Amino acid sequence: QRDLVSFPLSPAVRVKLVSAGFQTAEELLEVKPSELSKEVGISKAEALETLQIIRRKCTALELLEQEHTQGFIITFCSALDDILGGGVPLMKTTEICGAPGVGKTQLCMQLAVDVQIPECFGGVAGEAVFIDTEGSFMVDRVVDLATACIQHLQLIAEKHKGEEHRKALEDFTLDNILSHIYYFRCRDYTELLAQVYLLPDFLSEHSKVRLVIVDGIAFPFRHDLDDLSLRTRLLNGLAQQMISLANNHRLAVILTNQMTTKILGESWGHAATIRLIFHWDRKQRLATLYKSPSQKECTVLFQIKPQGFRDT
Amino acid sequence: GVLRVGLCPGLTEEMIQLLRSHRIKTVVDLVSADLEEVAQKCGLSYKALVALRRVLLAQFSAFPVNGADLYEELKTSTAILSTGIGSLDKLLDAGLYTGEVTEIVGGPGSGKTQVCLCMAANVAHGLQQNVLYVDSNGGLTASRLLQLLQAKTQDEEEQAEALRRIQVVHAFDIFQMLDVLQELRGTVAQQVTGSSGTVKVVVVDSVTAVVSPLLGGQQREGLALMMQLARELKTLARDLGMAVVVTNHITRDRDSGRLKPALGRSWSFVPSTRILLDTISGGRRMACLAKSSRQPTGFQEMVDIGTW
Amino acid sequence: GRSSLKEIEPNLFADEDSPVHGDILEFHGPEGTGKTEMLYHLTARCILPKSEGGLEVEVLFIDTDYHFDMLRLVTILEHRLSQSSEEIIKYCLGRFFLVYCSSSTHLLLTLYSLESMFCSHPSLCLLILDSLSAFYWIDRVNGGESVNLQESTLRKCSQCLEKLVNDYRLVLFATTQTIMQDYRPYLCKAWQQLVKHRMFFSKQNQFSLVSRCLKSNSLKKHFFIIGESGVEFC
Amino acid sequence: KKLKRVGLSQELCDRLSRHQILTCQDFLCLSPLELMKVTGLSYRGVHELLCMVSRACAPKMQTAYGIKAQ
Ligand SMILES: Nc1ncnc2c1ncn2[C@@H]1O[C@H](COP(=O)(O)OP(=O)(O)OP(=O)(O)O)[C@@H](O)[C@H]1O
Ligand SMILES: Nc1ncnc2c1ncn2[C@@H]1O[C@H](COP(=O)(O)OP(=O)(O)OP(=O)(O)O)[C@@H](O)[C@H]1O
Ligand SMILES: Nc1ncnc2c1ncn2[C@@H]1O[C@H](COP(=O)(O)OP(=O)(O)O)[C@@H](O)[C@H]1O
Ligand SMILES: [Mg+2]
Ligand SMILES: [Mg+2]
Ligand SMILES: [Mg+2]
C-alpha cells in the first residue's frame, strides 16, 4: 500500500480524492479517467495526469569500475592532484572557498581548459559550461592556458612517435578548444535560479559536456535586499539540483564561495561533497582539504604562473 | 477505503450501488453506521450486512499480540550489528539494534558518512550481509569502501565479493526517496523467504538533504511529507525487522544555545536512538548518546576516524 | 471490582481514593521527558504479581510511534522482582497486550474491533494510547481548509474511546507530544472535553511532573528519577 | 516581468494574483510545494511552469570562440 500523500499529486486533487474515500494508490489503478472524473469532481486532464503519476541499482563494484574508467580532471598541480586523489572527480560537487585573490577563478579556467585533453593522454575529452556570476571570466587568459597545455602535450607526444598521439593532437587546437566552452552570465539571483532550472535541458542535447562551473555562489555586491532569493536558492537550489545534475549526466560541478574564508547558513556547510579552502600563510598560497569523504585533511602548496596553476 | 468489487467476498455491484445511493461509500461508513436503518432500506438482508461488517473488520483491522509471544519472537529475531569501531560499540552497548531507527547527528565533517561507510564495510565483509546505501549528497565513494576493506583483509577476491554485496541508490528528492523505500518494501514483500540476498541494513545519508527544502512558508505539506518519510522508515525498521541508520544535521538556537537535531519538534520524536558527534584534526571526535530507551544520556567517549 | 487511582499510583493520586468508573488522563511534554517511562512504571505496577506489590491486572498498549521497547520493559521487570527469573517475567508479560497502528483510519478500525477484546478480558482495566497525536499532520493536510474534514477520523476515534471508557470502567492514559510552542492544545474539541487530569513532564536523572486536575482545578508538583529499575519518586 | 507576458493562462494568472504573485521574481522565489498549493498543479506541472518562466528570465548562451571572435 502506498498512501496518496507520498505521490507528487496536486494538493487539491488529493483532497478531492480523500474526500471521496480514496486513501492509497492501489485503489486508483483500475478506474478509468472518465469514470474517475465523475466519481470525484475533477476534470479529464487532471484524471489522466493523476493516473499517469500513480502508475509511474549498481553495486559498489560497478561504481568502482565506473570511477576507474571515468577519469579525474587534472589541474597541473601535482600536490593538489595527489591530495584530491588524482584530480577533480566526476559525479561530485566540489566547493572552493577562500578570500578574494587566492586564485579560485584561475583554477576554474584551468579546469575548463584541462577537461578537453584527449583520452589517449589520460584526459576526459569533454566540454565545459561556465556560469559566471561575477564577470571575472577572461578569454585571453584561457588562450594563454590553452597554448601552454598544447605545448605540454606536444612535448609529451614526441616519446610515442606516430601512435594515436599524432592523430589526437590534430583535433586538440586553440580554436577547437575555445569552441567547446559554453558561457552564461547570470546578473542576479533570479537569472541564476532560471539558468539552474534550465541546465538539464541544455545538457540533454550537449552530451559531451563533462564540467559545469558556477563561479560565485553568492553575488559580490552583498548588502542583499534580496535575501529571500538567496535563501530560496541555497535551499536545495544548489545542493540537490547540482548533485542530481552531476550524477545523471556524469559530470563534475565546481562551485566557488567567497563567504567562507577561514578554517551563509548552517545547512550550507553540508552542501558540497568536497571543500577546499585556499588561504595565505607566510605570504604563500596553501590549499587545505577541509572536508572530504575519501581523503584525510591535508595542506599543500601551490602557485600561479603565466602558464597557469603550478606547483611551488 | 472506497467500497469496490473484489475488495472482500460478498460484494456485488448492485449492493455497492444501493449503499452509495444511501450515502455509504467507504468501509469506515459501513462499519460505523447503524446497520438496522441501512438494512430496512435498500431491501438488503440484515444478516448479510452483519457478515460484511465482520469480514471487513477482520480484514482491515490490527489485532493484539500477547507480550510473552512478542518476547519469544524478539529473543531470536533481534540482532546487534557491530559498527567496526570499538569505542562506538562501547557507547551503543555492542552497536546497532535491528528493528529501530538510529540517527547520527553532527556538523559538517563530524564523521557521519565515515561511520556509515565503516558500518557498511563491516556488514558487507564481517557479516557478509547485503547493505542498501541511499546517497542523497554524493558522500559514498567506492574507493573509500575498498580502502576500508583492505585494512580488514589482503585477499583481493574477498574485497571484490564484499564490494558486490553493497547496493548503491541515488535519490535526490523526497519523492525519489519515497519511491526507493516503497520499492524496497515491495521487494521484501516478494522475497518472503529470501535469505542469500535480502538486504538487512539500510543507510540513508542526509535525510535532511531531502526533507529540509520541503519546509518553508505557512504551508503544512512539508510537515506531512516529512512525517510520511518517518512512517516509511519506521515500517522498514519495525515491520521488516531491519536496521535503519539515518544521518541528520545539527543546529543551535539563538536563545536555546544547546545542540539539537535540525528538522524541528515533530522530527525530534522520530528516532529511537540518537548519537551526537562533536569535535574538540583529521580524527579525534567525541560521541555521546542524546536519546535512548535503554541507557542514561550524556555519557561521552572518544572515537578516531584516522584509525578506523 | 476496580482499583482506585490512589492504589494504582499513590504518589500522583494521593487524593483520588474513589474507585474508577471511567477516567481519562493525558501525559504531555517534549521528547525524552519520561512519558513512556511513566507508562512502563504504571504497566509494571499493574502486571506485577500481588506477591511483589503489584495489582496483577491486564494492560493494553496501542503503539502508533513504534517506539515500544520490549527489552527495556523486561529489564525493568527483572530489577523490580525480588527473585528474577525467565518464567516469572513470562508470567508478567502474559498480562500485557500490544497493538501496532499505522494510520488514523487503521486506528479507528482497530478501536471498533477492540469491543470484543474488552468483552473477553474483564481484568483489562488500563488502556494506554502512546502518541495519540502521531497522525496529526497527515490528517490535517489531507483534510484541506475544512476543520471538520481534518478532525473527522480523530473525532470518531474520540467518541469511540469515550464509549469504551464508559462502558467498561477503564482508566485511559493518552500520551501527546509537544509539537507547537507550556501547553498549546491542538487536538479536536471532542478529545479535549473528555480529559479530566492532565500532566506535564519536564527534564530536571532528575525529572519533574506538574499535575492539573480539572475536576477541582488543583495544581501539584512532583519530582522523580529514572534508573535501571524504572521510575522512583523523590 | 509580469506573468501574463510569460505565457501563462489568464485563469492561472488571476489565481496567482489572488496571492499577490504578479512577477517572475515573485514566482521563482517560491518553492515547488508552495507553488503547488497556490496554483493547484502537480509537481511536474509546477516544474514545467518554472521552466516556462525561467526561459523568459534565463540568459543567452555564448561560446568562448564567439567571445574571442568579437
Ligand atoms: N581516507 C581517510 N582517512 C582518514 N580520515 C579521513 C579519510 N577520508 C576522510 N577522512 C576524515 O573524515 C572527514 C570526513 O567526514 P565525513 O565524510 O563523515 O563528514 P560528515 O560529517 O558526514 O559530513 P556531511 O554532513 O557534510 O556529509 C574528513 O574531513 C577527514 O577529516
Ligand atoms: N537504564 C536506564 N537508566 C537510567 N536512565 C535511563 C535508563 N533508560 C532510560 N533512561 C532515561 O529515561 C529517559 C526515558 O525517556 P523517554 O525517551 O521514554 O521519554 P518520552 O517522553 O517517552 O519520549 P518521546 O516523546 O521521545 O517518545 C531516557 O531518555 C533516558 O534519559
Ligand atoms: N598572468 C599571470 N601570471 C601570474 N599570476 C597571475 C596572472 N594573472 C593573474 N595572476 C594572479 O592570480 C590571482 C587570481 O586570483 P583570482 O582567481 O581572482 O582569485 P579569486 O577567484 O579567489 O578572486 C591574482 O591575485 C593575480 O595576482
Ligand atoms: Mg575570481
Ligand atoms: Mg556525509
Ligand atoms: Mg516514549
A253: left (phi over 0), alpha (psi -120 to 50) or beta: beta
User: A173 phi and psi, to 5 degrees?
Assistant: -135, 160
Cβ(C42)–Cβ(C9) below 8 Å: yes
CB B69 within 8 A of CB B75: no
Would you call C75 and B297 a contact, using CB atoms and an 8 Å cutoff? no
Q: What is the DSSP letter of B33?
A: S
Opening angle at CA C49, ends C43 and C52, nearest 5: 100
Strands C218-227 and C230-233: antiparallel
Three state DSSP letters for B44-58: CCHHHHHHHHHHHHH
Burial class (CB in 10 A: 0-12, 13-18, 19+), C90: middle
Cell 558540497 maps to which residue? Answer: A272
User: Is the beta carbon of A101 within 6 A of some atom in ligand 3?
Assistant: yes
User: Phi and psi of A308, rounded to 5°?
Assistant: 120, -155
H or E, element range at A247: helix A240-248
∠ at Cα A22 (A19, A24), nearest 5°?
135
Mark yes or no for CB contact C69/B296 under 8 Å: no
A231, A232, A238, C18 from A228: Cα distances, Å: 5, 6, 15, 60
Q: How far apart are the C-alpha atoms of C110 and B103, rounded to whole Å? A: 31
Q: How far apart are CA B45 and CA B15, in angstroms?
A: 11
- Residue ranges of the alpha helices (H) in chain B? 13-21, 27-31, 35-40, 46-60, 67-77, 86-92, 112-121, 142-150, 156-164, 174-190, 207-211, 221-234, 265-268
Would you give the end-to-end CA distance of chain C in angstroms?
A: 31
Side-chain half-sphere exposure of C127, counting CA atoms within 13 A: 23
Query: Tell me, what DSSP letter sits at residue B78?
Result: -
The strand pairing partners of A309, in sequence order, are A304
Q: What is the DSSP letter of A294?
A: S
Instruction: State how far residue D65 is from chain B, nearest Cα, in angstroms.
Output: 34
The alpha carbon of residue D1 is apart from the nearest alpha carbon of chain A, in Å, by 11
Q: Copy the grid coordinates of residue B176.
A: 525519489
Q: Which of B245, B222, B224 is nearest to B233 (CA)?
A: B245
Helix (H) or strand (E) holding B66: strand B65-66
What is the 3-state secondary structure of chain C?
CCCEHHHHCCCCCCCCCCECCCEEEEEEECCCCCHHHHHHHHHHHHHCCHHHCCCCCEEEEEECCCCCCHHHHHHHHHHHCCCCCHHHHHHHHCCEEEEECCCHHHHHHHHHHHHHHHHHCCCEEEEEEECCCCCHHHHHHHHCCCHHHHCHHHHHHHHHHHHHHHHCCCEEEEEEECCCCCCCCCCCHHHHCCCCEEEEEEECCCEEEEEEECCCCEEEEEEEEEECCEEEEC
Provide, as residue numbers in chain A, all residues whose Cβ is less than 8 Å from the Cβ of B221: 11
Chain B CB contacts of A3 under 8 Å are 228
Instruction: Give the residues across from C58 on adjacent strands.
Output: C124
Which chains does chain D touch, 3 or more C-beta pairs < 8 A? A, B
Specify whether the CB–CB gap between B287 and B232 falls below 8 A: no
Distance CA A144, CA C26 (A): 75
The number of angstroms, rounded, from the C-alpha of C224 to the middle of its chain's C-alpha atoms is: 18
- Residue C26 β-bridge partners: C174, C198
**Cβ neighbours of residue C201 under 8 Å, at least 6 residues apart?**
C27, C28, C29, C30, C33, C34, C35, C38, C207, C208, C209
Q: Which residues of B touch C (CB under 8 A)?
A: 1, 27-28, 31-32, 57-58, 60-68, 70-71, 74, 78, 100, 220-221, 223-224, 227-228, 231, 234-235, 237-238, 265-266, 268-269, 272, 291, 293-294, 296-297
Residue B292, CA atoms < 13 Å, CB-side half-sphere? 22
Element (H, E) at D51: helix D43-55
Q: Which three cell numbers stand for residue A114?
A: 584541462
| Nine-digit cell string for C75 | 529489564
Domain layout of chain A by residue ranges? 60-310
Q: Which amino acid is at A51?
A: L
For cell 557498511, name the residue.
B120
Which candidate in A183, A185, A202 is best for mutational testing of the D interface (most D CBs within 10 A)?
A183
- Coil, strand or helix at B194: coil
Q: Which residues contact D11 (CB under 8 A, 6 or more apart)?
A: none
Buried b or exposed e, range B58-90, using 16+ CB within 10 angstroms: eebbbebeebbebbeebeeeebebbbbbebbbe
Q: Which residues contact B248 (CB under 8 A, 6 or more apart)?
A: B103, B104, B105, B206, B207, B208, B261, B262, B263, B267
Across the strands, what pairs with B56? none
Given a contact cutoff of 8 angstroms between Cβ atoms, the answer to whether B115 and B104 are in contact is: yes
Cβ neighbours around A72 below 10 Å, total: 18
Q: A60-310: what fold?
A: Rossmann fold (3.40.50)
In sequence order, the 6+-apart residues with CB closer than 8 A to the CB of B109 are A275, A290, A291
Q: H or E element: which one contains A248? A: helix A240-248
Residue B191: how many CB atoms within 10 A of its CB?
13
**CATH no. for residue D12?**
1.10.150
CB contacts of B216 in chain A (<8 Å) are 235
B142-151 in b/e form (b: 16+ CB < 10 A) is: bbbbbebbee
Residue nearest to atom 22 of ligand 2 (CA): C36
E strand residue ranges, chain A = 58-59, 93-98, 127-132, 181-185, 209-215, 252-257, 274-281, 284-291, 299-301, 303-305, 308-310
C-alpha cell at C60: 493494553
Helix (H, G, I), strand (E, B) or coil at A181: strand
Greatest Cα pair distance, chain B, in angstroms, is 80
User: What secondary structure letter does DSSP report for B239?
Assistant: I
Residue A57 burial by CB count (10 A; 0-12/13-18/19+): exposed, middle or buried? exposed
Give the integer Cα–Cα distance in Å for A243 and A260: 21
The owner of cell 464509549 is: C163
CB count, 10 Å around CB of C50?
8
Eight-state DSSP code of residue A240: H
Nearest CA-CA distance, residue B214 and chain C, Å:
14
Q: CB within 8 A of D41, min separation 6: which ones?
A: A10, D35, D49
Residue whose C-alpha cell reads 588561504 in the numeric block: A279
SS3 A124: coil
Indicate the SS3 state at residue B70.
Answer: helix
> In this structure, are residues B166 and B131 in contact, taking their beta carbons and an 8 Å threshold?
yes
Distance CA A60, CA A123 (A): 24
Could you say which ligand is closest to the alpha carbon of residue A134? 4
A197/D36 CB distance under 8 A: no
| Ligand 4 centroid to residue A277 C-alpha, Å | 14
Q: Tally the domains of chain D.
A: 1
DSSP type of residue A119: G
Sheet holding C96-100, edge to edge: B65-66, C96-100, C58-63, C124-130, C171-177, C23-29, C197-203, C207-213, C218-227, C230-233
Q: What is the full DSSP assignment across B95-162?
A: SEETTSEEEEE--TTSSHHHHHHHHHHIIIIII---EEEEESSS---HHHHHHHHHTT---HHHHHHH
Instruction: For residue A167, count CB atoms less than 10 angstroms from its CB and return exposed for 0-12, middle for 13-18, buried for 19 or more.
Output: exposed
Residue A5 half-sphere exposure toward CB, CA atoms < 13 A: 24
For residue A25, the 8-state DSSP code is G
**Cell (9 digits) for A88:** 577533480
A156-162: long-range contacts (C-beta < 8 A, 24 or more apart)? A156/A121
Please state, in angstroms and as integers, the Cα–Cα distance from residue B121 to each residue in B88, B149, B162, C152, following that order: 15, 6, 8, 48
Distance CA A262, CA C149 (A): 53
Exposed, middle or buried, C83 (CB in 10 Å: 0-12/13-18/19+)? exposed
Q: Grid coordinates 542530481 are at which residue? A: A244
Q: Domain boundaries in chain B?
A: 67-303
Rg over alpha carbons for chain C, rounded to the nearest Å, is 17
Cβ-proximal residues to A99 (8 Å cutoff; 6+ apart), any chain: A258, A261, A279, A280
d(CA D27, CA D30): 6
Distance from CA of residue A85 to its chain's centroid?
18
Phi, psi of A309 (to 5 degrees): -70, 130
Return the closest-CA partner of residue B231 out of C72, C137, C91, C31: C137
Domain range spanning residue C217? Answer: 5-233
Cα separation, A301 vs A78, in Å, equals 10
Give me the half-sphere count of Cα atoms (radius 13 Å) on the Cβ side of residue A14: 29
Residue B252 bridge partners (DSSP): B259
List the resolution, Å: 2.2
The answer to whether C86 touches C77, Cβ cutoff 8 Å, is no
Best CA proximity match to B98, nearest among B207, B296, B240: B240
CATH number at residue C25: 3.40.50.300
Strands A299-301 vs C197-203: parallel, antiparallel or unpaired = unpaired
Is B168 strand, coil or helix?
strand
Instruction: Give the H or E element holding residue D37.
Output: helix D32-39
Distances (CA, A) of A11 to A126, B84, B182, D34, D37: 43, 45, 21, 10, 6
For strands B101-105 and B243-248, give the pairing. parallel
| Distances B80 to B10, B91, B92, B127, B296 between C-alpha atoms, Å | 47, 13, 10, 11, 19
Closest CA to C213 of C229, C202, C200, C226: C200
- Nearest to residue A267, comparing CAs of A305, A295, A240, A248? A240
- The single-letter DSSP state of residue A237 is T
Q: Rounded to whole angstroms, how far apart are CA atoms D64 and D70? A: 10
Q: For residues A75 and A117, what is the distance between their CA atoms, to the nearest angstrom?
A: 11
User: Is residue B232 a contact partner of residue B178, using CB atoms and an 8 Å limit?
Assistant: yes
Q: What's the angle, vertex CA B4, arms to CA B2 and CA B6, rounded to 5?
A: 135
Amino acid of residue B298:
G
Count of CA atoms in the C-beta half-sphere (13 A) of A301: 7
**Cβ atoms B282, B267 nearer than 8 A:** no
**Into how many domains does chain C fold?**
1
CB A273 within 8 Å of CB A40? no
CB A147, CB A174: distance < 8 Å: yes
Amino acid identity, residue C208? S
Which residues have CB under 8 Å from D57's CB, separation 6+?
A190, A191, A194, D1, D24, D28
Euclidean distance between CA atoms B136 and B304, whole angstroms = 25
Q: Is the CB of B277 under 6 A from ligand 1?
A: no
* Topology adopted by domain B67-303: Rossmann fold (3.40.50)
Q: Which three three-digit cell numbers place residue A18? A: 480523500
What letter represents residue A114's amino acid?
D
Rounded to a whole number of angstroms, the distance between the first and last alpha carbons of chain D is 30
CB B38 within 8 A of CB A61: no
Distance CA D11, CA D18 (A): 11
Considering only the C-alpha atoms of chain C, give the largest distance between any 2 of them, rounded to a whole number of Å: 58
φ, ψ at C171 (rounded to 5°): -110, 120
Domain span holding position D60: 3-68
Of B283, B206, B279, whose CA–CA distance to B245 is shortest? Answer: B206
Please provide the size of chain B in residues: 308
Buried/exposed code over B256-273 (b: 16+ C-beta within 10 A; e: otherwise)? eeeebbbbeebbbbbbbb
The β-bridge partners of A300 are A287
Q: How many CA atoms lie within 13 A of C30 on its CB side?
A: 14
Q: How far apart are the C-alpha atoms of C191 and C24, rounded to whole Å?
A: 10
